[PDB]
Amino acid sequence: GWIFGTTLDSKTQSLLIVNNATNVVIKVCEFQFCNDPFLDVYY
Amino acid sequence: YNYLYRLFRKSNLKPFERDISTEIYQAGNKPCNGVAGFNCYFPLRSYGFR
Ligand SMILES: *[C@@H]1O[C@H](CO)[C@@H](O)[C@H](O)[C@H]1NC(C)=O
Ligand SMILES: *[C@@H]1O[C@H](CO)[C@@H](O)[C@H](O)[C@H]1NC(C)=O
């Protein structure tokens, strides 16, 4: 997936595209994730 | 005073664009650092609607 935004923090809406094995979710939310993002392989 | 409008930092909005950020607007050289003082004020203003 990808993240799009100006500052990618809690002060600005950011667009997130996540393509896991079943579907694609696109969320436009202002939630701040950590820099150098990661996705867990196993639960 | 429920309805509010916006005053940006000489940045016109794009067509069909909406902002929600409520950071302190700066008009001078010094940073506001979250304090609304001289050349620093809250950009969201309320209508009268009387
Ligand atoms: C993929 O993401 C969707 C939405 O987040 C979720 O419903 C689904 O269970 C996920 N599938 C896997 C295999 O993680
Ligand atoms: C989008 O962000 C850039 C970088 O801060 C800015 O120069 C531009 O004016 C912004 N567009 C707006 C507020 O419509």
Side-chain angles (χ1 to χ4, degrees):
Chain A
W2 299 267
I3 46 171
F4 305 88
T6 64
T7 48
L8 301 151
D9 51 351
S10 184
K11 312 173 179 57
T12 303
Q13 304 281 318
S14 71
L15 188 153
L16 168 60
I17 295 176
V18 170
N19 189 179
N20 64 340
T22 74
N23 45 359
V24 161
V25 298
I26 309 175
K27 306 180 199 299
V28 186
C29 299
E30 69 271 11
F31 169 67
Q32 171 255 331
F33 213 72
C34 298
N35 51 314
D36 196 48
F38 83 111
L39 193 144
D40 212 336
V41 170
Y42 207 74
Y43 43 85
Chain B
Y1 302 96
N2 299 10
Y3 303 113
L4 299 168
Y5 57 95
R6 188 70 75 91
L7 300 169
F8 273 100
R9 51 102 173 174
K10 61 177 180 179
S11 293
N12 307 308
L13 278 193
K14 262 69 181 179
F16 289 142
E17 207 207 344
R18 164 192 62 248
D19 200 32
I20 208 68
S21 75
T22 54
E23 319 302 310
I24 315 291
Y25 173 53
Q26 181 185 338
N29 191 22
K30 58 172 178 63
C32 301
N33 58 89
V35 182
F38 204 110
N39 287 0
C40 280
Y41 64 93
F42 197 59
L44 275 75
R45 302 284 297 269
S46 47
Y47 293 114
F49 285 164
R50 313 205 158 87

